[model samples]
Target: MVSTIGIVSLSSGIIGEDFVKHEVDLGIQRLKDLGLNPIFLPHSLKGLDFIKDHPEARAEDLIHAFSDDSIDMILCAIGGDDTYRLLPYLFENDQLQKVIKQKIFLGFSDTTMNHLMLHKLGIKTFYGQSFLADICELDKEMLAYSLHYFKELIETGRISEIRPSDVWYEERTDFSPTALGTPRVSHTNTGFDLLQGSAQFEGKILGGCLESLYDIFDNSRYADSTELCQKYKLFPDLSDWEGKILLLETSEEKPKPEDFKKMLLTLKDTGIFAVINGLLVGKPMDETFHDDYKEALLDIIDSNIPIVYNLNVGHATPRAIVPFGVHAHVDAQEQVILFDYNK
Candidate 1:
């Protein structure tokens, strides 16, 4: 069957500029270059300023994309601070359940909220590659990774190994908008280290931008709601506790190591780290905070929790496509990440 992916512009909060559409269009073009039919739901181009021009932007258009049958996947244009504003509108429409039941939803960063919502509804989502940020890059290397994973997820229906590509970085424009830049992917790995747990623990993976997830957790609707109740009902075949694996990475907004440590500590306090047997942590791109931050994060994880570091499955160059909520194996000793969908 031919796969159709839809793109959604969710970064209206930050990149509130006309370039958002340019990037989206460029991304779609790249997808076409990769041999996949890419479709943009009407209003996927609805700019951030439109939110002010039409307060109904969230209500009138966002839901329609999810309900459309022809669009097989929805890609958030970029990550932002308030993408959750669309949640209220989502809950009102039952048709979203239909899209979730049939197609794939792609995005990460602030879009993580949408992923959690789908996970609660028993839908599988991806935490890698964005349109403007990944595909629209002038560098062919970055786009190369995006195209590879986009194909893997749509055609293979599974992803296990996620490696950092030779070309990856946060500043697509060399930290300068006007400067002509070369796509520089840092090839040396800080090296991966496995902390705690056994060789491989399998579970359905779920998680995304750590800071973005905080917004959803702080929102009473998601934190207190019974979405978990429906989630349990949807995946009756899998054990509730063991069925999910949590994979996480921080963004360039660059929260301090202590702050990240606190988040893990919070997870520990909430008994989350205690339940989920598998945990994969992305190598922080924050050069200044890498060492100290990782140490603080490791301190919080239960000595028993199997933790793998430097798997190159993060916001790094040549980033691989990781399938969320799918059965996978992560091996730290040999530095190999693999998955088994049918098992």
Candidate 2:
């Protein structure tokens, strides 16, 4: 059902740069190979400087994508740090809310900010993976687990259920044309580990990169990022998270244990830990500092809600696409998240 995809560079314009042209072409070709039309919105493929300097351009592209009738889905070219810059352009005049439609809007990383913006509009979105991050992967083809959910998103416009990935890959260091056929180092993956509480829980999954959520409150990363989010009331209220599952993962930046604890504390300060039915944690990229992060979670989160860790989602390679706002029944013992779409 998702034939025409409108790709927008709402955050990073690296997709428009010369260095990644080969990757972009590969991603576009892959989409076509699947019988899908991937259209770059105006200003999307422009070089980095231009796209970075023009936040309003990014806003226009998103607004136009939503209003454009032929755009079956809105895909982020890549995630960047300043998508928050477009907040004023989209929310100032109720611009995005007016034209927004129900479509498959997908991306991860800093794209987390955009997802929260759409969530504020009561629109559901898919998280985990972007055009350059997954499809443009310099490999023989997309990773099996990632491709599986992406195909389901395009073919059926819905992912009925999800299971753990069998393997995890090392994060690639070189993304040049020379690395086209190179494969990342991979390892066998372990099944989901229930850190605490019951293994079964029910809720619609929400949340994204833990660091991005932290940026919503901490201006230390970007001085005005927190300000813009607050002015727009971007983060949902505590009542909104009640009974919902929080899906969180670390970025490739791989914050240290101290910083990870700080980020987790921000959520605790918001009282999110007290109301959510469960928590879903993504596998750390390259499994870096994995145990330290787990220890931090156990130490900080006093909530007795179910906590399922090491999901194959978010910044980690071989990501799984998860639908936000869709009610899901999560059963850790079975290693499945079954969606109740008819609801």
Candidate 3:
């Protein structure tokens, strides 16, 4: 069971700024109330510009979290675009390799880049949720379903199964202190919808935010993100993806249908679709372009591959944790995804 968590802003340093003080304090209090000690690694709270200027510090916090035997889990402070900048800092001198050890690492969005880095080292991690994004929620309390899985992770050290949330929240528009203690607008959520092929499939899932994945291939956003990812061999090649369940969730950017097609085609060009056992798409925030994403998937992806949509994970509210590198059985008809449950 995880007793102490070391928080790091491997991506954004929003946790340190004055604007977010109220939320950060609330998150710290929430952790303490859960009976877990929270530690912010040295450089994590150094604020936005400091973090953006120092990728090495981000690498240091990650390495320190893994090296410290006292830290049972490492929770990302939040996700941002350029965490890929830390690649050289982590692997160039084999820094992360020298300190890396098993522990629970959890976050979503650009943390996907961090997750891929850890995955390449053969360390399994839990994806979805983060310190600032989920824990610091302005709600009166953590969303019940989200909190349930989080509590189970801390108490048992691994998630058993992920079922659909009964409802999903609309993406929040306000994050000010005045917004605190208010409830989110929610909608009744339908269970996972099977888009094609068989309702049952199994594989060790590995993938992340589609926008983040797109950045790895296209250098338009960051000229060096592609170079760094390729340098470290961060993204596992198609062969490694064979027989794996490729998980894809759209970011808050909510790309248009045409742009979504480009991202999908990029992966399709990698020949990933023909090899993976199944596909899982997270419920987009506010169900934005819900039908369009479904249409894009059905149009581009072969019908032979099992495709499931509207899972309550990633950018959506009330997320359920999904473990990477462990075998998962996706039984869409049953509306459940079960893990191998090993230590």
Candidate 4:
């Protein structure tokens, strides 16, 4: 059971950002209300003054939080653009090993950098929820859905299945005082769309925000198949990817449809698309690239590889928590995805 959550700011801090601070406070209160202790690391609140020029300080806070025995879990304040900056320190330090062995870490978007690295270290980190997502609003329905699955996973370490939300909010306005109490306008959801394949497929879960993958790729960290296998231990050989599911989602900085196509092409060139058992794409931000993404995806991979889109993942509200290095079962006929964290 997770009794205490230690909050850290890896991407962006909440110091000078008043609206963000408000959301963080709201999330903190929500944690308290749930009977969980919420403790903020120094960097989560020192962004305006310290994090602007000293990004490594954020990394230090992360290390400290994970090493602290009292912190059962670590939650990121919010995802930002430059978590990759902390990669060198994180990858070199032995402290991260202690972190992975001791605590549960959760965050998405740019936090993907950390998640992927943690996966390399054989750590399971959640690709869902941040302080911003949990505390910004007070919708009972949305809150209930997020809280239920989050608590279930933390307590049981497994979730049988994840269903679509009755309603989903794709876009939101600025975080102003007026937006504080106002609930987001939601659209009627059609749920997950099974684009291809027939039989049920099961595999280990991998991948995160598509944009962050490019960051890790460009940094020459996991440059090639050999490097990925030898350094990151992502896959032992080409055959290893045959049973893995590729998870993907877009960020608020939604890429163009052409950009999405190029990314798929890059993965294909890298031999990722050819081997993965299936694809699980989270809801696109504001549904901006929903149609185009579908068109682009069809233009890239083979038809036999199954795909299920518009999942309750990524930047979308009421998102489901997905863990790295876990087993995921995809039922194309039934249009459902089940995560087996027990393995």
TM-score of each: 0.83, 0.98, 0.98, 0.88
| Local accuracy of candidate 3 as per-residue lDDT tens digits, 111-130 | 89999999988899999999
Q: Total clashing residue pairs per candidate?
A: 8, 0, 0, 0
For 169-263, candidate 2 gives per-residue lDDT tens digits of 99988755678888899999997988988889999999999988898999998999889999999999989999999999998889999999988
lDDT of each prediction vs. the true structure? 0.61, 0.91, 0.92, 0.73
Candidate 3: residue 71 lDDT (0-100) = 96
lDDT of 1 by residue, 114-207 (tens): 7766776777677777766667675533456666776777676556576444444443435444422356544445455676678677776777
lDDT of 4 by residue, 221-279 (tens): 33442333235443224575677888889988788998888777766777887888888
Tell me the alpha-carbon RMSD of every candidate. 4.2, 0.9, 1.0, 3.5
Question: Which is better, 2 or 3, measured by lDDT?
Answer: 3
lDDT of 1 at 198: 80
Location of the lowest summed lDDT over 10 successive residues in candidate 2: 173-182
Q: Name the Cα RMSD for model 3.
A: 1.0
What TM value does model 2 have?
0.98
Best by lDDT: 3
List ranges where model 2 is wrong by over 4 Å: none
